């Protein structure tokens, strides 16, 4: 399974089946046939496979990268420090890519789940998507195919000079 | 389709433009004109997942018809009454829109007679 | 009377509406007979090799080899740089390069000028 | 295997529109030498084909009968 | 449409031979569209594919 | 036995193709007449179309000046 | 990378000590073993390239080209062993030695950490290719084709030698890993303009650029089949590899130096594709189609966006497999009719149905049928060029019409229609030939299942 | 579907179409009755006979072959050769 | 062996696809995302028991 | 115009071919059989009117304006027979017409499936290869100097000889393989 | 979409009025129906267009199957001017061709009535390009014209096919 | 094949023209070369620029699909004038009349679509009326802001 906080679903409210006609629908009989013929043998096979899993339990681990100094506190043309800064920046860039992918999945799942009233009932996912796309665009857009932490730092410093000039002219 | 010939081949100053009307106030000619009553709650037609074209002033019959259409499955021919109720109230809404159109055309005739009377009087 | 057929480059004149089709003159008889003789000699030269049991391969066609050699290798040894070829090589060789250069250059100057003025709607554009 | 062709003497153009064609040709001094070749198309089972409203109303009689029976069935069955 | 085309179909049995109009030749030769566009547009490409670009 | 080819004459018909063709033609006309008997408004009209010129100025609010 | 260099060198005593009936089987077997071993290079990371030593390194750009290079050698040995059957034994071993030497030069061309060693290997690949074309080519024009192939390349590459030694004297190094971190911006000057031309024009010739492509419809045509396979599938891609290594150092001047050359490809891929509509020579049609496909790679490297580099490296790998299979199909008909004229042998689906199925599959991969990696590279380049300038879709989309129109014409002229009557030596498809077609097509179809390995260092 | 033609069946059909032609008396006609010499017909009549053969058997005879089929046996042999009868 | 087509081509694929969707696809988030079911005035929720209140009384038109 | 045996069409041949093309296009215009039969006898009368014209310039002129008549009165989509050029089924089965020499390339395990057929093919191939030299020396002893004049071929003049250049006419594929 | 669909459904149904190959006539029929589908997308009725797809599939595949039955029964003959008299000779194909032609033209309460007629009722009663509606109606008349052209030359009248049945 | 049967330079003397015509297997009176403007044709014959569809289909060709004989001098654009490609066959209607009719029909239809767009048909009705301020929250309006009250009355 997954975490319901990073992949949120609201609680499901299905209505009770209230038949008006006396004609029995084929869907309930086919659901009973799918329970007998399909779901129970698959369940038995998965229980067998899971017992064979439980006979030999072992683990893997999620790798933790400790934070090395970034590109701002590396001396210029010092490859032993700015190498580590660049590798850390590439891993942060790949993780930010996956964050934007998570928010896209949230947005698309909200659209399909809310169905016809999706424009009203998915304003929060749209707003979080807009914020994270704005942040990703201000951070990594237009760096080129030869992007680096130096390119990203230069873009950030250009944006900060533009913001400082815009603040100074508005005072 | 005579109104197309009246607007295109006649004059268009007395004929109402479809894209921008009513150009007259809704109280212009009415003592205490009451609003249209919306039966279905906004949350009710929100939770019925109706199309936004279908969330008009007569969607409560549509909610009744869709609940009938769900509850009477597989007998798909068993909700003609609720369908005719919704179709009749959509018909009444269409008659109201025709009444708005004819009201605007008659008030443009009134304004035409007003300006001709003001030109002939003074 | 009847509308005369006006032949074009891609819609040629019919065989029956050509006024040279009805030539009974002896020089046209000689030309048609000599073309018949050439065609019959080439036909006989083909189908002697085509009907050979000992032959197993390709009846080579020097007309075909001649056509491919004219289309491929004979073009430069029979080229002369003159007025016509120079104007056609400048018109068709560097002309479209200049044209697409100015089109794409004007488009990218307009787009870059809109982007660095904060005018282009680049709201969700993060794949590039 | 061996197929027997029918007689050639049974194809006569009298009573067919080939007769009208031959009469309008003899009205201006002509004669129709391929009439008996075309005579089989207007004779036999391929004579008297239906009209277009008879083509559309194929099976209309039994359909109308089944309609009246079903309307009477639902008119009695409501009671 | 059925009535007008039944009239057109019943006139086919008649012994009247007219020359075809430009309306018939326009409806029958596919609005003249594949007769033009499939002769002209490949020509203008393929000559340009040999005289201009290749040779 | 399969159909033998014939020459310049009407071909052999099976009983089955004739009765099935007539049965589906009768099925078509039964369905057309049945649905025309029951629905009768998808063709001829569902609701009456009101005349706007017959409406009073009182219900549309046209004060006489 | 020495675990691949030494087996490739041990292929030389493997072919010079084999018995006279055994020199194809042993080299095919052990070159397939080297190609199996090549998959260990897929130890790639999301941040760090696989950096073996001071001399050799392999990122996710060099790795698919290495796998394709080490896979192409057994396929060239299968393709070339039929028409060299009556060849002298020692000349047969010299041919195999030139192919082995070319693989050896290529697998340390792509892994060269330092750029002048890249240049030495990059220009060392000329000599076996030149010898294969001019010695085992079939016609008279192999000598002129060897002269054109040598002298466009050297006229391009000797300013690259001067420019790389200039970078060595200025930056202090030509290590690519050092130059990732010490790269200085290249401003606008005439000195930097000719710096850019000297760094780029060699790879422009090797791609080839339109207008500089003239060596290719001779060198790809006059070569034997192993020569055409290695020229189309690998040796064009040295230009794109070297561009992706060298445009790191050429910023930001590239953003206005790319403008003529982008035009030269965006119009040129319209022209050469149009040229493929009127090619009577089938092998020349495949050559001009290779120019047409590499023009998109030139545009994608010059516009230098991530989608463009991913589509460019996908299109390089996909075009390597596709054009190699197309030349092998053209040779499979040349070994029967002994003429490269496409209109000669027609209606071959009536005579060779399974080979016509291979023709169909290679045509569909040539016209970028989804979800093949031909379409993946094609599509990503089209996305990045639309983001570059929106009008370019016209020159993209029109290209994708003409790219279909010669691919199926090649399928219709050769395989469909009435068969030629006077040609009667059309043997059935040999097992070697169908094996060759499958060893091209089946990796090209399996790479659609996992395309992330052929999408470069910035996937 | 597609019943196989034989020489006897083609001969029967060709002579049958020629017995329904009102410029040939059906008692003088045989398999070798030459149309211009024995039956005394016009070249226009020979063209109409070959066109009736085309409408009978359903395939066009070209004019370079139509202007040389001058007896019914030649027509039967031509239809035989162009349809490969007695396989 | 009379209805082996309903066993090999249908029922064994229903087994394979149900196992694949139950224990590999629905165990990952947002892979099978279903539209939430339609709720009417007068319904009873299965997961809550909360009766949806019916609509307001109609201004009857006929 | 373009014929294998003759270099040209005679005037009489041109009149016959115009007559046949006019009747086919008339049948395309005049769909029903009685109506076509009426207008076809009328067209036969129009061709019978100028049958006995002795001035060859006048007959050639009448043929020329009759061609212009036909070109104005042609059908835009004339009726084409299905196996006629321009037909719907024209050259449809050419993908199924495999030549005979491909049977030589078969494997002996798939030749052993038909023992009598290939045993009978061997005497056809033997008859062809013993007739070939006799028919080549027949062609060279009968062709005039300067090459052949027409594309016609002589028949087998002797007993035991086969006609020259006969193999790819006799062993052509069937129309429905 | 509205102008393009009305242009297509005019032009192809106009071209179908005078064709003689039966498969060409039914191909112009299906392209005229696709033009009608593009029209009813252009009037903001996508679900009626999809209903017309699902409706159109049945009778148009059946009309091509009836044409193929005729073509195979007449030995690969595809031209309507060599047909006729097949009302009784091919009775089941006659029945199904009449039912398909009436479903195409919009006979009431056959399958084509349940989308196409509604399409017309939505193309009339909408803020529409009026020339597109008028060409849509001219195309609707042309559908009846070429449908009874099929029925008249193929099924009605007298035989025109060759003599070996 | 050898040297003197390959294509060569443009013939100027009549004996060179006659040797060229003998090389291309055709009569001297029928042998026209391309005009010597230096485009790269040389002595190659200008065949009369017809498609291969116009060739006689009932004639027994050496190549029946191409309608082309063995040894026959091929057209320069033979790969272009194949029957899978560009046709030059005579059309029942004149080419200029076809172009005028098609351009007139397309231009008139586009003009009438422009006219009908300028003058659209509609129904004698008002606007469709929606509750809750023309469905403000449904159309994506934010709930923190408040729209102006859109009110519809009975009529
Ligand atoms: C890792 C495990 C992977 C397992 C799955 C496999 C994944 C793909 C691998 C490669 C698949 C193709 C190989 C077979 C075809 C090539 C040879 C051939 O033609 O044989 C005909 C022959 C049958 O014909 P025949 O009657 O005997 O004689 C042939 C006739 O002479 C004449 O024959 P013909 O002309 O009548 O018929 C030829 C016909 C021609 O058919 C066509 O032209 C139609 C195909 C194109 C249009 C339709 C498809 C469009 C794309 C959609 C499909 C892909 C995505 C689908 C998923 C949903 C959407 C995302 O070919 C087919 O129908 C082949 C069906 C499969 C086509 C796949 C796509 C090829 C089209 C071009 C590229 C398209 C983009 C890339 C797609 C890549 C997908 C992975 O086949 C065989 O005998 C099979 C040989 C063995 C096949 C082995 C396959 C695996 C190879 C890899 C080995 C190593 C990994 C282990 C896997 C083992 C699996 C068992
Ligand atoms: C395939 C055929 C075409 C191939 C094209 C190859 C590229 C075309 C351009 C090459 C120019 C020559 C090499 C330039 C190397 C630049 C290195 C460098 O640092 O430059 C900056 C240096 C600058 O000097 P510096 O760097 O020492 O000075 C310090 C910096 N400043 C200038 C600020 C003080 O440039 C030069 O010194 C000169 C560069 C231009 C050289 C012009 C001569 C050659 C002309 C073009 C020849 C093209 C090929 C000819 C053959 C064709 C076939 C026969
Ligand atoms: C220009 C011009 O007219 O050049 C003609 C000249 C030869 O002149 P001529 O016509 O022989 O007298 O020809 C010459 O002087 C030689 C060519 C002149 C330069 C042509 C430049 C463009 C060539 C095409 C480039 C394609 C890319
Ligand atoms: C034929 C086969 C196909 C072709 C193969 C490739 C061959 C050509 C390769 C080089 C292409 C041209 C060079 C690249 C142009 C990039 C932009 C540029 O430099 O434009 C020319 C220049 C623009 O002016 P500007 O940018 O102000 O220059 C001042 C720089 N400090 O303009 C000027 O200043 C005016 C012109 C000055 C002369 C320039 C000559 C050197 C460049 C061409 C060599
Ligand atoms: C919503 C917007 C809607 C816009 C609509 C209007 C715009 C498009 C206008 C029409 C353009 C396409 C039509 C013209 C080209 C048609 C080519 C073709 O199919 O030719 C067929 C021809 C032979 O076929 P045919 O003679 O008909 O067959 C009779 C049976 N023997 O076959 C041949 O001769 C073979 C030829 C092969 C090579 C073809 C070379 C020409 C390629 C043209 C590509 C055009 C690309 C345009 C790109 C636009 C980008 C925006
Ligand atoms: C006014 O007439 C409103 C109707 C829409 C414009 C006119 C439409 C005319 C075509 C439809 C009716 C056809 C009657 C034969």
End-to-end CA gap in chain G? 23
Cβ contact C8–L69 (<8 Å): no
Instruction: Please give the positions of H annotated as active site.
Output: 42
Q: Where are the alpha helices (DSSP H) in I1-62?
A: 5-6, 12-20
Torsions phi, psi for C92 (to 5 deg): -100, -10
Domain, as residue range, for H85: 1-87
Q: Mention every residue, 6+ apart, whose C-beta is less than 8 A from residue K3.
A: K42, K129, K132, L113, L117
Q: What is the DSSP letter of H39?
A: S
Residue D1's H or E segment, with its range, is: none
**Atom nearest to G159 CA in ligand 2:** 13
Compute the residue count for chain A: 171
Q: What's CA G282's distance to the chain center, in Å?
A: 18
Closest residue, chain C, to G305 (C-alpha): C128
User: How far, in Å, from the CA of E40 to the mean position of ligand 5?
Assistant: 9
Cβ-contact J129, J157 below 8 angstroms? no
Distances (CA, A) of E3 to E6, J126, K145: 5, 71, 9
Q: Identify the CA nearest to D34 among candidates H48, A120, L106, G157.
A: H48
In contact, G106 and G34? CB cutoff 8 Å: no
Identify which of H12, J35, D10, D54 has the alpha carbon closest to the alpha carbon of residue F9.
Answer: D10
Residues J139 and J162: their CA atoms lie apart, in Å, by 12
Tally Cβ neighbours within 10 Å of residue J117: 11
Which residue's alpha carbon is at the smallest distance from atom 8 of ligand 6? B1
Ligand closest to Cα of K120 equals 6
Residues I55/B60, Cβ–Cβ less than 8 Å: yes
Tell me, letter by letter, the H, E, C secondary structure of C43-102: HHHHHHHHCCCCCCCECCCHHHHHHHHHHHCCCHHHECCCHHHHHHHHHHHCHHHHHHHH
Does an H or E element contain G51, and which? strand G50-51
Contact G96, G28 (CB under 8 A): no
User: Rounded to the nearest 5°, which phi and psi values hold at G112?
Assistant: -70, 115
| Contact between chains at E17 and J77 (C-beta distance less than 8 A) | no
Q: Which residues of C26-54 are buried (b: 16+ CB within 10 A; e: fewer)?
A: eeeeebbebbbbbbbbbbbbbbbebbeee
Q: What are phi and psi of H35, to 5 degrees?
A: -75, -35
Percentages of chain D per state (helix, strand, coil), in multiples of 5: 55, 0, 45
Task: Provide the 10 A C-beta neighbour count for residue G383.
Answer: 19
| Longest CA–CA separation in chain B, Å | 74
Distance of CA G394 to the CA centre of its chain: 26
Dihedral class, residue I47 (left if φ above 0, else alpha if ψ from -120 to 50, else beta): alpha
For G264, list phi and psi in degrees, rounded to 5: -60, -25
> How many whole angstroms separate alpha carbon K142 and alpha carbon K14?
7
Q: What is the DSSP letter of G50?
A: E
Nearest to K164 by CA among A94, L13, H10: H10
Give CA–CA dist E14/B23, Å, rounded: 63
Residue of H nearest to D12 (CA): H20
Q: Which of G170, G61, G158, G164 is nearest to G115 (CA)?
A: G164
Q: How many Å apart are CA D66 and CA D74, to the nearest integer?
A: 12
Give the bridge partners for K90, in sequence order.
none
* Ligand 6 atom at shortest distance from the alpha carbon of B3: 1
Count of CA atoms in the C-beta half-sphere (13 A) of K128: 28
The 8-class DSSP code of residue G58 comes to E
CA angle (G385, G390, G393) in 5-degree steps: 65
Q: Is the peptide bond before K36 cis (omega within 30 degrees of 0)?
A: no
Query: Mutate which of H43, H57, H85 to disrupt the J interface (most J C-beta within 10 Å)?
Result: H43
The answer to whether the CB atoms of J105 and G418 lie below 8 A apart is no
Q: In 3D, which of I22, G331, G318, E6 has the Cα closest to residue A41? A: I22
Q: Find the L64 Cα to ligand 4 centroid distance in Å.
A: 55
Give the 3-state secondary structure of residue J111: helix
Q: Which SS3 state, helix, strand or coil, does residue A36 take?
A: helix
Please name the residue ranges forming H helices in G338-391. Answer: 353-366, 373-388
Q: Where are the beta strands (DSSP E) in G76-163?
A: none
HSE-CB for A137 with a 13 A CA cutoff: 14
Furthest C-alpha separation in chain C: 85
Instruction: Name the residue with the closest Cα to ligand 3, atom 16.
Output: C81
C-alpha distances out from residue B106 to B30, F50, G402, K89, Å: 14, 17, 62, 65
Please name which of D32, B119, L2, L10 lies closest in space to residue J43, comparing C-alpha atoms.
Answer: D32
I51: which strand partners?
I44
Residues in CB range of L54: below 8 A, 6 or more apart? C12, L88, L89
As a whole number of angstroms, the distance between CA C101 and CA G56 comes to 40
CB contact at 8 A, H19 and H29: yes
Q: Could you tell me which of A85, A162, E2 has the C-alpha nearest to residue K151?
A: E2
Q: Which residues contact A68 (CB under 8 A, 6 or more apart)?
A: A84, A85, A87, A88
Distance B1 CA to ligand 6 centre (A): 6
Cβ neighbours of residue B102 closer than 8 Å, sequence gap 6 or more: F52, F53, F55, F60, L124
Burial class of C56 by CB neighbour count within 10 A (0 to 12, 13 to 18, 19+) = exposed
Rg, Å, chain G Cα set? 21
Distance set, CA I37 to CA A13, G71, G167 (Å): 7, 54, 67
- Spatial contact of J34 and D20, defined as CB atoms under 8 Å apart: yes
d(CA G130, CA G142): 9
The gap from C-alpha E9 to its chain's centroid, in whole angstroms, comes to 22
Distances (CA, A) of A125 to A121, A129, A134: 9, 6, 14
- Ligand nearest the Cα of residue G353 is 1
Non-local CB neighbours of J90 within 8 Å, separated by 6+ positions: J80, J82, J83, J84
Q: Which two tokens stand for residue G394?
A: 């016209």
Q: How many CB atoms lie within 10 A of CB G35?
A: 20
The answer to whether J75 and J31 have CB atoms below 8 angstroms apart is no
Measure E38 CA to ligand 5 centroid, in angstroms: 6
Is residue G213 within 8 Å of residue G261, measured between CB atoms? Answer: no
Residues 8-47 of I with CB under 8 A from A: 11, 14-15, 18-19, 22-23, 27-30, 33-40, 43-47
The count of domains in chain H is: 1
* Closest listed ligand to the CA of L123: 6
Nearest CA to ligand 5 atom 13: E37
**Cα separation, G299 vs K42, whole angstroms:** 38
Question: Which DSSP string do the residues of L92-138 spell out, in sequence order?
Answer: SS-HHHHHHHHHHHHHHHHHHHHHHHHS-B--S------HHHHHTTT
Give the SS3 label for residue G100: helix
Query: Which of G47, G251, G305 has its CB closest to that of A87?
Result: G47
Q: Which of G269, K75, E49, B112 is nearest to L86 (CA)?
A: E49
Angle at L24 between CA L19 and CA L30, to 5 degrees: 85
Return d(Cα L66, Cα L53) in angstroms, integer. 9
E strands, H8-86, are: none
Question: How was this one solved?
Answer: cryo-EM
Instruction: List all residues whose CB is within 6 A of at least one atom of ligand 1.
Output: G 353-354, 357, 360-361, 364-365, 369, 371-372, 442, 445-446, 448-449
Within chain F, residue ranges assigned H as helices are 15-38, 57-60
Only one residue has tokens 């400790």, namely A66
- Residue the block writes with tokens 């729209």: L147
- Phi, psi (5° rounding) for residue G109? -75, -45
How many angstroms away from the CA of J121 is the closest CA of chain H? 15
Which value, in Å, is the radius of gyration of the alpha carbons in chain B? Answer: 21
Biggest distance spanned by C-alpha atoms of chain J: 72
Q: Is the dihedral of CA G197, G199, G204, G206 positive or negative?
A: positive
Q: How far is the C-alpha of C60 from the C-alpha of G279, rounded, in Å?
A: 20
Residues forming a β-bridge with L68: L63
Geometric angle at alpha carbon J130, from J124 and J133, rounded to 5°: 135
φ and ψ at J159, to 5 degrees?
Answer: -85, 130
A142: distance to nearest CA of chain I, Å? 31
Residues with a CB atom less than 6 Å from ligand 3: C 81-83, 86, 89-90, 93-94
**Helix orientation angle between A123-140 and A149-169, rounded to the nearest 10 degrees:** 110
Q: Please state, in angstroms and rounded to a whole number, the distance separating the CA atoms of residues C61 and L78.
A: 15
DSSP state of G57: E
**The pair of three-digit structure tokens given for residue I44, joined into one six-digit string:** 């009873």
Residue D54: CB partners within 8 Å, gap ≥ 6? none
**Chain CA centroid to CA G102, Å:** 13
Phi, psi for residue G114 in degrees, rounded to 5: -100, 145
Of the candidates F11, F22, F36, the beta carbon closest to that of K89 is on F11
Residues 52-91 of K with CB under 8 A from H: 72, 75, 77
Contact C14/C5 with Cβ under 8 angstroms?
yes
Q: How many residues does chain J have?
A: 177
- Do residues B89 and I62 lie in contact, with contact meaning Cβ atoms separated by under 8 Å? no
Provide the 10 A C-beta neighbour count for residue J108. Answer: 7
Q: Is C17 helix (H, G, I), strand (E, B) or coil?
A: coil
- C-alpha distances in Å from residue J175, one per residue of A140, H85, J79, J95, J97: 69, 11, 22, 11, 8
For residue J76, which of G239, E28, D34, G374 has the smallest C-alpha distance? E28
* Interatomic CA distance for residues G206 and G294, integer angstroms: 10
Does residue B83 contact residue B65 with C-beta atoms inside 8 Å?
yes
Are the C-beta atoms of A145 and G305 separated by less than 8 Å? yes
Residue G54, number of CB atoms within 10 A of its CB: 10
Q: Which DSSP helix (H) or strand (E) runs through G151?
A: helix G142-171
- Indicate which of L74, L77, L82 best probes the interface with G, i.e. most G CBs within 10 Å of its own CB: L82
Determine contact, residues G346/G419, Cβ cutoff 8 Å: yes
Q: Is E34 in the pocket of ligand 5 (CB under 6 A)?
A: yes
In which residue are the tokens 């964050």 written? A99
Q: Is the CB of G391 under 6 A from ligand 5?
A: no
Ligand 2 pocket test: which of G115, G154, G191 has the largest number of ligand atoms within 8 Å of its C-beta? G191
Q: Which residues of J128-167 are buried (b: 16+ CB within 10 A; e: fewer)?
A: beebbeebeebbeeebeeeebebbebeeeeeeeebebbbb
Supply angle C-alpha G76, G78, G82, rounded to 5. 110
Q: Specify the long-range contacts of residues H33-37, CB closer than 8 Å, at least 24 apart.
A: H33/H71, H33/H72, H34/H70, H34/H71, H35/H70, H35/H71, H36/H70
Q: Which atom of ligand 5 is nearest to the CA of G397?
A: 50
d(CA G269, CA G289): 9
Contacts of G387 (CB under 8 A, 6+ apart): C125, C127, C128, G305, G307
């Amino acid at each position: 399974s997954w975490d319901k906080d990073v992949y949120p679903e609201p609680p499901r409210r299905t209505p009770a089946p209230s038949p008006q006609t006396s004609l029995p629908n084929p869907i309930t009989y086919l659901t009973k046939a799918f329970d007998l013929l399909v779901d129970r043998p698959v369940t038995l096979v998965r229980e067998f496979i899971e017992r064979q899993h439980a006979k030999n339990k072992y683990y893997y681990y999620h790798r933790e990268f400790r934070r090395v100094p970034d590109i701002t506190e590396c001396h210029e043309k010092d490859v032993l420090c700015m190498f580590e800064a660049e590798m850390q920046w590439k891993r942060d860039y790949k993780v930010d890519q996956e964050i934007v992918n998570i928010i896209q999945e949230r947005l698309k799942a909200c659209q399909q789940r809310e169905g016809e009233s999706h424009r009203q009932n998915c304003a929060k996912e749209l707003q979080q998507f807009t914020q994270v796309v704005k942040a990703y665009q201000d951070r990594y857009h237009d760096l080129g195919a030869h992007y680096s932490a130096r390119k990203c730092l230069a873009k950030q410093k250009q944006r900060m000079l533009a913001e400082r000039k815009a603040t100074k002219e508005a005072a | 389709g005579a109104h197309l010939a009246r607007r295109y081949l006649g004059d268009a100053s007395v004929e109402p433009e479809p894209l921008r009307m009513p150009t007259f106030p809704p109280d212009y000619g009415f003592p205490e004109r009451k609003e249209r009553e919306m039966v279905a709650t906004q949350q009710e037609m929100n939770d019925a997942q109706l199309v936004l074209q279908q969330r008009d002033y007569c969607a409560h019959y549509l909610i009744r018809f869709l609940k009938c259409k769900r509850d009477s499955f597989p007998n798909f021919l068993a909700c003609k009454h609720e369908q005719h109720d919704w179709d009749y109230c959509e018909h009444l809404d269409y008659v109201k829109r025709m009444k708005e159109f004819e009201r605007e055309r008659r008030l443009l005739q009134r304004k035409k007679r007003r300006e001709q009377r003001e030109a002939d009087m003074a | 009377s009847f509308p005369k057929y006006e032949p074009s480059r891609l819609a040629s004149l019919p065989t029956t509406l050509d006024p040279a089709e009805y030539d009974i003159s002896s020089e046209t008889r000689k030309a048609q007979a000599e073309r018949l003789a050439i065609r019959s000699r080439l036909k006989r030269e083909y189908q002697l090799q085509y009907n050979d049991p000992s032959r197993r391969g390709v009846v080579e066609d020097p007309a075909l080899i001649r056509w491919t050699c004219a289309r491929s290798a004979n073009v430069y040894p029979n080229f002369r740089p003159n007025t016509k070829t120079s104007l056609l090589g400048a018109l068709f060789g560097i002309g479209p390069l200049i044209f697409w250069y100015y089109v794409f250059k004007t488009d990218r100057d307009r787009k870059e000028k809109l982007i660095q003025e904060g005018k282009l709607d680049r709201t969700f554009n993060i794949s590039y | 295997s061996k197929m027997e062709l029918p007689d050639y003497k049974q194809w006569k153009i009298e009573g067919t529109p080939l007769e009208t064609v031959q009469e309008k040709l003899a009205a201006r001094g002509l004669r129709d030498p391929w009439g008996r070749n075309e005579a089989w198309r207007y004779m036999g089972g391929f004579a008297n084909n239906v009209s277009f409203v008879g083509a559309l109303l194929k099976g209309f009689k039994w359909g109308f009968a089944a309609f009246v029976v079903a309307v009477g069935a639902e008119y009695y069955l409501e009671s | 449409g059925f009535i007008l085309a039944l009239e057109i179909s019943n006139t086919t049995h008649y012994l009247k031979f007219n020359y075809p109009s430009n309306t018939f030749k326009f409806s029958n030769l596919l609005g003249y569209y594949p007769t033009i566009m499939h002769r002209l547009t490949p020509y203008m490409n393929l000559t340009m594919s040999q005289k201009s670009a290749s040779s | 036995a399969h159909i033998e080819p014939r020459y310049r004459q009407f071909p052999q018909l099976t009983r089955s193709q004739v009765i099935q063709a007539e049965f589906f033609s009768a099925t078509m006309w039964f369905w057309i007449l049945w649905r025309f008997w029951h629905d009768s408004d998808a063709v001829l009209g569902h609701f009456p179309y009101p005349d706007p010129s017959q409406w009073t100025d009182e219900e549309l609010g046209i004060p006489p000046d | 990378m020495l675990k691949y260099i030494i087996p490739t060198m041990m292929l030389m005593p493997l072919t010079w000590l084999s018995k006279n009936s055994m020199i194809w089987i042993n080299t095919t077997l052990h070159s397939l073993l080297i190609s199996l071993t090549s998959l260990l290079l897929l130890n790639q990371f999301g941040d760090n390239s696989l950096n073996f030593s001071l001399t050799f390194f392999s990122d996710s750009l060099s790795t698919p080209l290495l796998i394709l290079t080490m896979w192409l050698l057994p396929l060239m040995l299968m393709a070339s062993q039929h028409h060299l059957s009556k060849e002298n034994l020692a000349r047969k071993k010299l041919f195999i030695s030139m192919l082995i030497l070319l693989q050896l030069f290529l697998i340390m061309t792509f892994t060269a950490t330092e750029l002048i060693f890249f240049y030495i290997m990059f220009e060392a690949t000329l000599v076996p290719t030149l010898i294969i074309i001019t010695r085992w080519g079939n016609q008279t024009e192999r000598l002129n084709a060897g002269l054109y192939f040598l002298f466009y390349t050297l006229a391009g590459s000797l300013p690259l030698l001067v420019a790389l030694i200039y970078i060595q004297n200025t930056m202090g190094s030509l290590n690519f890993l050092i130059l990732q971190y010490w790269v200085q911006p290249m401003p606008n000057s005439w000195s930097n303009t000719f710096m850019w031309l000297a760094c780029m024009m060699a790879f422009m010739v090797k791609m080839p650029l339109y207008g500089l492509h003239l060596w290719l419809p001779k060198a790809h045509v006059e070569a034997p089949i192993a020569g055409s396979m290695v020229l189309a599938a690998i040796l064009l891609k040295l230009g794109g590899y070297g561009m992706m290594r060298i445009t790191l150092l050429l910023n930001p001047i590239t953003d206005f130096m790319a403008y003529p050359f982008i035009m030269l490809s965006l119009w040129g891929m319209i022209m050469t594709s149009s040229i493929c509509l009127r090619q009577t020579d089938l092998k020349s049609l495949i050559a001009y189609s290779s120019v047409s496909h590499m023009a998109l790679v030139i545009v994608a490297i010059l516009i230098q966006t991530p989608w463009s580099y991913m589509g460019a490296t996908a299109l390089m790998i996909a075009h390597g497999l596709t054009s190699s299979m197309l030349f092998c199909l053209a040779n499979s008909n040349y070994e029967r009719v002994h003429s490269r004229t496409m209109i000669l042998a027609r209606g071959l689906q009536t005579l060779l149905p399974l080979m016509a199925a291979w023709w169909l599959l290679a045509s569909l991969t040539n016209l970028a049928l989804p979800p093949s990696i031909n379409l993946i590279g094609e599509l990503f380049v089209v996305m990045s060029t639309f983001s570059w300038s929106n009008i370019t879709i016209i020159l993209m989309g029109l290209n994708m019409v003409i790219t279909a129109l010669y691919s199926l014409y090649m399928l219709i002229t050769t395989q469909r229609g009435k068969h030629t009557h006077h040609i009667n030596n059309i043997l059935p498809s040999f097992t070697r030939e169908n094996a060759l077609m499958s060893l091209h097509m089946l990796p090209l179809l399996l790479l659609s299942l996992n395309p992330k390995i052929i999408l470069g260092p910035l996937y | 579907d597609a019943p196989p033609l034989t020489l006897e069946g083609i001969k029967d059909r060709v002579l049958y179409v020629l017995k329904l032609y009102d410029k040939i008396d059906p008692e003088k006609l045989s398999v070798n009755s030459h149309f211009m010499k024995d039956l005394g017909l016009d070249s226009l009549d020979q063209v109409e006979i070959i066109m009736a053969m085309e409408d009978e058997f359903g395939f066009e005879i070209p004019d370079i072959d139509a202007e040389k089929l001058m007896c019914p046996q030649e027509i039967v042999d031509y239809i035989a050769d162009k349809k490969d009868v007695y396989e | 062996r009379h209805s082996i087509f309903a066993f090999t081509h249908v029922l064994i694929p229903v087994w394979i696809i149900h196992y694949y969707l139950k224990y590999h696809v629905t165990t990952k988030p947002y892979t099978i995302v279903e539209k939430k079911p339609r709720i009417f005035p007068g319904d009873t929720i299965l997961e809550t028991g909360e009766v949806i209140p019916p609509m307001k009384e109609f201004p009857d038109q006929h | 115009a373009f014929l294998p045996s003759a270099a040209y069409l005679t005037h009489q041949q041109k009149v016959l071919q115009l007559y046949k093309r006019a009747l086919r296009h008339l049948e395309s215009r005049c769909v029903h059989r009685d109506k076509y039969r009426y207008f076809a006898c009328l067209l036969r009368a129009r061709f019978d009117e100028h049958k006995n014209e002795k001035d060859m310039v006048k007959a050639t002129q009448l043929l020329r304006e009759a061609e212009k008549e036909f070109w104005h009165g042609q059908h835009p989509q004339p009726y084409i027979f299905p196996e006629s050029p321009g037909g719907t089924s024209y050259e449809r089965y050419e993908c199924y017409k495999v030549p005979e020499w491909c049977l030589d390339d078969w494997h002996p395990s798939e030749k052993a499936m038909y023992p009598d057929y290939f045993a009978k093919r061997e005497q056809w191939k033997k008859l062809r290869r013993e007739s070939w030299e006799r028919e080549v020396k027949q062609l060279q002893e009968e062709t005039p100097v300067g090459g052949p004049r027409t594309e016609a071929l002589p028949p087998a003049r002797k007993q035991g000889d086969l006609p020259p250049l006969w193999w790819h006419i006799v062993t052509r594929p069937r129309e429905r393989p | 979409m509205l102008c393009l669909g009305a242009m297509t459904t005019l032009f192809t149904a106009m071209c179908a009025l005078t064709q003689n190959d039966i498969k060409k006539i039914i191909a112009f029929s299906t392209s005229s129906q696709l033009g009608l589908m593009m029209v009813t997308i252009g009037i903001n009725q996508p679900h009626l267009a999809f209903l017309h797809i699902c409706t159109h599939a049945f009778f148009k595949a059946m009309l091509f199957m009836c044409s193929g039955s005729i073509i195979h029964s007449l030995n690969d003959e595809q031209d309507i001017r060599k047909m006729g008299g097949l009302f009784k000779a091919m009775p089941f194909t006659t029945t199904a061709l009449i039912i398909g032609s009436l479903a195409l033209t919009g006979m009431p309460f056959l399958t084509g009535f349940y989308s196409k007629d509604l399409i017309i009722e939505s193309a009339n009663t909408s803020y529409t390009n009026a020339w597109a509606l008028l060409m849509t109606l001219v195309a609707t008349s042309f559908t009846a014209i070429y449908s009874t052209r099929i029925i008249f030359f193929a099924l009605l009248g007298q035989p025109r096919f060759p003599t070996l049945i | 094949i050898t040297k003197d049967m390959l294509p060569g330079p443009y013939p100027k003397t009549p004996e060179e023209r006659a040797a060229a015509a003998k090389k291309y297997n055709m009569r001297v009176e029928d042998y026209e070369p391309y005009p010597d403007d230096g485009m790269g044709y040389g002595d190659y014959p200008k065949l009369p620029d017809r498609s291969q569809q116009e060739r006689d289909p009932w004639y027994d060709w050496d190549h029946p699909d191409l309608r082309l004989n063995w040894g026959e001098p091929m057209h320069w654009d033979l790969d272009m004038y194949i029957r899978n490609r560009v046709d030059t066959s005579p059309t029942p209607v004149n080419w200029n009349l076809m172009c005028k009719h098609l351009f007139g029909f397309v231009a008139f239809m586009l003009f009438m679509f422009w006219v009908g767009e300028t003058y659209p048909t509609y129904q004698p009705v008002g606007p469709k009326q929606y509750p809750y301020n023309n469905l403000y929250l449904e159309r994506g309006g934010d709930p923190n802001k408040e729209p102006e009250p859109v009110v519809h009355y009975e009529i």
